[PDB]
Structure 1
Amino acid sequence: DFDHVYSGVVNLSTENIYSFNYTSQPDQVTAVRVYVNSSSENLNYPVLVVVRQQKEVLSWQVPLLFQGLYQRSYNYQEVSRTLCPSEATNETGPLQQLIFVDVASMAPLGAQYKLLVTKLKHFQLRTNVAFHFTASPSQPQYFLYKFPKDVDSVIIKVVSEMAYPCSVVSVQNIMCPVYDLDHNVEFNGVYQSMTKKAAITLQKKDFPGEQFFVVFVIKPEDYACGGSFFIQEKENQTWNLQRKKNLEVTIVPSIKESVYVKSSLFSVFIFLSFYLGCLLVGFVHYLYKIYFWNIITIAVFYALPVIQLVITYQTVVNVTGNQDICYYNFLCAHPLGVLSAFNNILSNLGHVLLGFLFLLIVLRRDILHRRPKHFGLFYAMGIALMMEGVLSACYHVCPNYSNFQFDTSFMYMIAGLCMFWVIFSAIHVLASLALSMDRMVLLVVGNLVNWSFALFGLIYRPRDFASYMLGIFICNLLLYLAFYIIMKLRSSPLFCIVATAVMWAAALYFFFQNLSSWEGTPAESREKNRECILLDFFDDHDIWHFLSATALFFSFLVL
């Protein structure tokens, strides 16, 4: 009988056998849950419990043992598992299934155990309905989701409160046995580790049975999630015996293709409106190949290896199912074809489109001029915007530690072409003063300002070098631009000057949102995921991509 806690004593000569019978009517799935524990603190004689089905046999040893790194062992006493859910179809029949539960051990004196069995009342997840459940490293849980007729793709969202312990969320097709162990859950299907948040995007076309399992498994230790380790002189960590993690799981229906074309149209058209706006001004007004050839060879030749590398990354993550390889923003990531994140890709179109307009207007200026005012450097930074925009997008196909270096290498390429923290701050101080009645006052002001960041870098010591470099470059360039304004006023159009500040003010708002942070473990990078914010298709980092284009464009227009 389910919902009852059996108690018994097992030893060498005596074993206990309990046969359970139950039925599962068609169109209803009934998963059995086994609840066992043992009070035997000894490990030389663990109690062995087996559950036998019509086709599958599952067995475990109690108290459960885990062998983490640095040869620490653990004694988990409460163990539990879910059996393979037999599925019934329109071929009707009250299937009078029976499940054998047998327990035995070889302890010379004995080992106490209490066994409880019960069907899971909430085993089939419902769409958009949040469910709450508690999982333990020795008590894994998994549930079945069935696709609806209209919906063709879903996003499964999991949120926890306390970051530790580490946990893994896996999605597999319905072919039992179900892989719900720490050493085996990673073999099949899609999965990702997590501490606080997770999100897996699925398509119905990849599941022939139009129903899939969702498996939750809690790790014994927390290295894989970037956690620490309490150094204890006792090999058997008896303190780590009641690990738990309150969990909430919600399955939302993925957006339809209607918003896909709406968001894409919005991106293209507004920059097309910039084309129309510039053309309207032109009609109203109507009423050096060495650098080009060298840079085009450098850009093309450098791009191809990273595209081959990244498309290789994209392919392997697509087939292996290891979703912790790429550091996406899994709450606001949208797939199309082979790309697993399309919003982060299309969002870089503005860089390509705005830069194209910059090259055309400079060409127009050059043509009119022909019919120290040089546009060669303008073309170099104009191409710089194009190449980075395409290259940054290809980085976002699968963001990682490896391909971030290639993201900023091209910026380092151009910077050179134009030409431990104490040392780093001191060198930055030297660069600030070497780069540049009242002339001395402003020079002291600029050096004092650059010294404030020097104290910031030396004390705070941020983990992102590129962000620190860009902030220094942004602050210094605006200072030079502000320098140009004040003396021009003192020397006796304007809208572009004002507009540059507004977008730059907007740009830095979304720059510091850090929704994805790859320097930590992939689980921690998923703590900072945030939902879609623009047209239900874009997130904050894409908004950073948009404003960074117009901020650079307006600043470049002043230049």
Structure 2
Amino acid sequence: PKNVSQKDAEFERTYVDEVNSELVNIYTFNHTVTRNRTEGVRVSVNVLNKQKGAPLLFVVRQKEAVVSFQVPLILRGMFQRKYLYQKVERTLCQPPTKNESEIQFFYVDVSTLSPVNTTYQLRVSRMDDFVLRTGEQFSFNTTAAQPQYFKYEFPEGVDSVIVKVTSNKAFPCSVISIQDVLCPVYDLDNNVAFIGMYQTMTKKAAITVQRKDFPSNSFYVVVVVKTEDQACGGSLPFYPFAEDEPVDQGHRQKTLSVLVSQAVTSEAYVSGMLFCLGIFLSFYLLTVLLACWALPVVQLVITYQTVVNVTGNQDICYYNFLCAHPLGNLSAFNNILSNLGYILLGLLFLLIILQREINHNRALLFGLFYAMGTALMMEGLLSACYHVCPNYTNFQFDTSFMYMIAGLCMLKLYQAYACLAIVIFFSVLGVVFNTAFWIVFSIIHIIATLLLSTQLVDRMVLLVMGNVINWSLAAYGLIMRPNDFASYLLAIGICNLLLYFAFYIIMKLRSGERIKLIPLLCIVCTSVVWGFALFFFFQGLSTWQKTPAESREHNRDCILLDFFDDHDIWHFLSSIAMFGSFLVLLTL
């Protein structure tokens, strides 16, 4: 019959042995565990012979679960590709023990059916750093045939943590998943998307884990390295189309550093809420003291957020995963809260103009400004709902109405619904989507600027300088193209808005009309505020042009009060900038 050989081998020892169609090798391993200190066990095997027909079959048997594979392991690409790996390392799943100290046995068996010998080296390692300590960085190497996973044990008094994993070289692609502590652990390429919360990453990833979702007060962080970098956004290699010939990928590896850090406590929310309310209520107090002296987008966003919450797939929404603090079912509560200033400040504009109008009516004994105020209020709803799940499908509304508001300003400089609709449809056309665009957009910009100047000695030279600087900005955008058209469009919009604001001031200076102190302070304050507003807008925390794995590279931590990142500062300063721009028009 078949010859079976047995050995009671030990940890930390590479055994080199031969196997053919006749030999079956059994290795028994004893392992010591305790309830307080749990440590993982890793099986690592190499094959030093090249066989394409009959591989070696390895099985690892435990008390509860069994695992099995074949080496040289063959993984699958995209177009019926076959990648060959010779080294495979896997970490066994050990269910939590009941008794204080129980000795666990596990067996490793080797077999094959090839008619010729084959040499393999096998080693079992007692993985020392199985448990992840809070606030400590651990670096490890993973390839496509060597998935890894570490157990993190929620400390006493921690509500939730964040797992941050970073890498230096962007490629190869990888998947980082969080799973509950229950055998078995899905660390293979095909079942890694079954349960848990997973993110595909190339350089950086961050996953927020809560204790309410894990009753056992622990979880597993599983890292897997893909074979083809198409998911991360790379360019697939143009290897010959071999249907039944496996091609080796050479040396592909990923070095990753993982750190689990406690998240913000409840104070961060209270300080962030009090700070936001304190800033905007100060304008209400100041105005009282002075007086004394989209639906379909909402449905899509809600559906996508529910899909993210229930599926565990975190590749749908483009959050700022490094600084995004959840509350309830909302995954990034600070991003929603940052738009509260739109509501309060737009409503303050309605108060101030209502006071002005009633004063004028009493003395005697405005619709466009109301439209701008209502647009500002609508920002606080539409942009807030967008940030519940940012994506390329529903991105236009985040900045579109903003351009629309600018139009109203321009209209009050020219002195309605038709021009607003034209602006909305042009924004939709432009954001539907590219060197041909890079050229046609510049041509259309030049033509539109010339026509706008024509419709409007000092004036002709002034418009010539405006067109010259506009063409300079167009060439700037065309040459390097460091950012998307979405940022560029808002940039040219605000620059042209301040540009026309300055032209009106210059026309006033050429006349004998003297600007009062209040409008002068208003224009200066609005301009300086818009400065930092554009500064923070040009950061680009998350970009939706590329794959989400790439979009994760530009995440940055919380900057203000440990609650708000740069985009929230953009919201905060954009609200003030529009308030000042409107007050410039009102008091002009």
The bucket for the TM-score relative to the shorter chain is over 0.9
Q: 1:28·1:88 contact (CA, 8 Å) conserved in 2?
A: no
CA contact (8 A) 2:134 2:261 kept: yes
Whether 1:391 aligns to 2:372 is no
Partner of 2:313: 322
Query: Secondary structure of the equivalent of 1:96?
Result: strand
Q: Is the 8 A contact 1:40 1:46 kept in 2?
A: no
CA distance in 2, matches of 1:528, 1:26: 40
CA deviations over 1:265-293 (Å, ceiling 9, x no partner): 11011100111011111101xxxxxxxxx
Kept after mapping to 2: 8 A contact 1:52/1:99: yes
Correspondence 1:332-347 to 2 at 5 A: 332-347=323-338
Alignment of 1:479-498 (within 5 A): 479-492=499-512, 493=518, 494-498=520-524
CA deviation map 1:316-347 (0-9, x unaligned)? 11111101111000000000001000110100
Report whether the alignment pairs 1:431 with 2:448.
Answer: yes
What is the CA-CA distance between 1:309 and the residue it aligns to? 2.0
Q: Which residue in the other structure is 1:376 paired with?
A: 367
Over aligned residues, Cα RMSD in angstroms?
A: 1.7
Q: C-alpha separation between the residues in 2 aligned to 1:390 and 1:110? A: 70
- Tell me how far 1:211 sits from its aligned partner: 0.8
More deviation in 537-546 or 494-503?
494-503
How far residue 219 of structure 1 moved from its aligned partner, in angstroms, is 0.7
The correspondence of residues 181-200 of structure 1 with structure 2, limited to 5 A, is 181-200=188-207
Q: Secondary structure at the match of 1:115?
A: strand
TM-score scaled to structure 2, two decimals? Answer: 0.88
Distance 2:500 2:404 in 1: 23
SS of residue in 1 equivalent to 2:350: helix
Q: Are 1:60 and 2:69 matched, yes or no?
A: yes
Quote how far apart the aligned CAs of 1:553 are.
Answer: 1.0
Give the conservation status (yes or no) of the 8 Å contact 2:30–2:103: yes
Q: Letter of the 1:481 partner, please give it.
A: F
Instruction: Tell me how far 1:418 sits from its aligned partner.
Output: 4.3
Cα distance in 2 between the residues matched to 1:6 and 1:86: 27
- C-alpha distance 540-408 of structure 1, shift in aligned 2 (>3 A): closer
Q: CA, structure 1 residues 237+533, in 2 after alignment: closer, same or farther (shift >3 Å)?
A: farther
Moved more, 102-111 or 411-420: 411-420
Alignment identity in percent? 60
For residues 365 and 339 of structure 1, do their structure 2 counterparts lie closer, same or farther at Cα, with a shift above 3 Å needed?
Answer: same
Per the alignment, in what secondary structure is the counterpart of residue 108 of structure 1?
coil
* 2: CA distance, partners of 1:204 / 1:252: 14
Q: Please give the alpha-carbon distance, in whole angstroms, between the structure 1 residues aligned to 2:399 and 2:564.
A: 24
Distance of 2:282 and 2:403 partners within structure 1: 33
Match of residue 118 from structure 2: 111
Preserved CA contact (<8 Å) 1:76 1:242: no
Matched, 1:69 2:89: no
**Which residue of 97, 114, 127 corresponds with 2:134?**
127
Equivalent-residue separation in structure 1 for 2:494 and 2:295 (angstroms): 29
2:559 is the counterpart of 1:528: no
Which residue of 366, 371, 382 maps to 2:357? 366
Deviation per residue, 1:439-479 (Å, 9 max, x gap): 22212101111112332344345663332221221111111
Alignment partner of 1:214 is 2:221: yes
Query: Which position in structure 1 is the counterpart of 2:7?
Result: none
User: Pick from 479, 493, 512: which aligns with 1:473?
Assistant: 493
Superposition deviation, residue 314 in structure 1 = 1.2
- The whole-number CA distance in structure 2 between the counterparts of 1:467 and 1:409 is 11
How many angstroms apart in 2 are the aligned matches of 1:100 and 1:390? Answer: 60
Residue 392 of structure 1 deviates from its aligned partner by: 0.6
Q: Is contact 2:498-2:527 (8 Å) kept?
A: no
Instruction: Identify which of 245, 251, 254 aligns with 1:245.
Output: 254
Give secondary structure in 2 for the equivalent of 1:399: coil
Which position in structure 1 is the counterpart of 2:431?
none
Q: Is the 8 A contact 2:74 2:246 kept in 1?
A: no
Q: Any conservation in 1 of the 2:17–2:119 contact (CA below 8 Å)? A: yes
The alpha-carbon deviation at position 84 of structure 1 amounts to 1.1
Distance 1:234 1:395 in 2: 43
225-234 or 12-21, which deviates more: 225-234
* Residue aligning to 2:410: none
How far residue 29 of structure 1 moved from its aligned partner, in angstroms, is 1.0
Is 1:356 the counterpart of 2:347 in the alignment? yes
Q: What one-letter code is carried by the residue in structure 1 that aligns with 2:161?
A: V
Q: Give, in angstroms, the shift of residue 237 of structure 1.
A: 6.2
Do residues 204 (structure 1) and 211 (structure 2) align? Answer: yes
Aligned to 2:37: 28
How many residues are paired up? 536
The offset of 1:212, in angstroms, is 0.8
Distance of 1:232 and 1:212 partners within structure 2: 40
2:466 is the alignment partner of 1:446: yes
2:385 partner letter = C
Could you tell me whether the CA contact under 8 Å between 1:140 and 1:218 is conserved in 2? yes
1:407 is displaced (CA, Å) by 3.6
One-letter code of the match for 1:433?
L
Q: Which residue of 2 aligns with 1:256?
A: 265
Name the counterpart of 2:299. Answer: 308
Further displaced range: 466-475 or 51-60: 466-475
Distance 2:67 2:463 in 1: 76
Aligned to 1:417: 417
Contact 2:84 2:249 (C-alpha < 8 Å) held by counterparts? yes
Kept in 1: contact 2:95–2:183 (CA 8 A):
no
Helix, strand or coil: the match of 2:238?
Answer: coil
Q: How is 1:138-177 mapped onto 2 (pairs within 5 angstroms)?
A: 138-177=145-184
The answer (yes or no) to whether the contact 2:59–2:108 under 8 Å persists in 1 is yes
CA distance in 2, matches of 1:337, 1:95: 41
TM-score between both structures, scaled by the size of structure 1? 0.93
Query: Aligned residue for 1:282?
Result: 291
AA matched with 1:246: T
Deviates more, 1:127-136 or 1:416-425: 416-425
CA distance in 2, matches of 1:387, 1:460: 35
Q: Among 581, 584, 587, which residue is 1:555 paired with?
A: 581
**In the aligned structure 1, how far is the partner of 2:254 from the partner of 2:132?**
19
Task: Verify the 8 A CA contact 1:463 1:519 in the aligned structure 2.
Answer: no
Query: SS in structure 2 opposite 1:251?
Result: strand
Give how far 1:532 is off.
0.6
Whether the aligned pair in 2 keeps the contact of 1:74 and 1:238 (CA below 8 Å) is yes
Cα distance in 2 for residues equivalent to 1:471 and 1:58: 57
Per-residue deviation at 1:305? 2.6
Show structure 1 runs of 5+ residues with no match.
Answer: 285-302
Q: Which amino acid aligns with 2:56?
A: V
Identify which range, 60-69 or 360-369, moves more after superposition: 360-369
Question: Is contact 1:130–1:250 with CA below 8 Å preserved after alignment?
Answer: yes
**Per-residue deviation, 1:307:** 2.0
Match of 2:566 among 532, 540, 545: 540
Instruction: Return the alpha-carbon distance in structure 2 between the equivalents of residues 177 and 88 of structure 1.
Output: 15
Deviates more, 1:177-186 or 1:380-389: 380-389
Separation in structure 1 between the aligned mates of residue 142 and residue 394 of structure 2, nearest angstrom = 36
SS of alignment partner, residue 118 of structure 1: strand
Deviation per CA, 1:231-284: give whole Å up to 9, x if none: 123745655132111111111011110111111111011100111011111101
Work out whether residues 40 and 127 of structure 2, in 8 Å CA contact, stay in contact via their aligned partners in 1.
yes
Structure 2 CA distance for aligned equivalents of residues 462 and 247 of structure 1: 28
Deviations along 1:140-173, one digit per CA (max 9) or x if unpaired, are 1001111111111101111111100101111111
* 126-135 or 228-237, which deviates more: 228-237
Which ranges in structure 2 are unaligned for 5 or more consecutive residues? 1-9, 408-415, 420-435, 513-517
Q: CA deviation at 1:358?
A: 1.2
> How many angstroms does 1:229 deviate by?
1.9
Asked whether the 8 Å contact 1:30–1:86 carries over to 2, the reply is: no
* Partner Cα distance (2:312, 2:28) in 1: 38
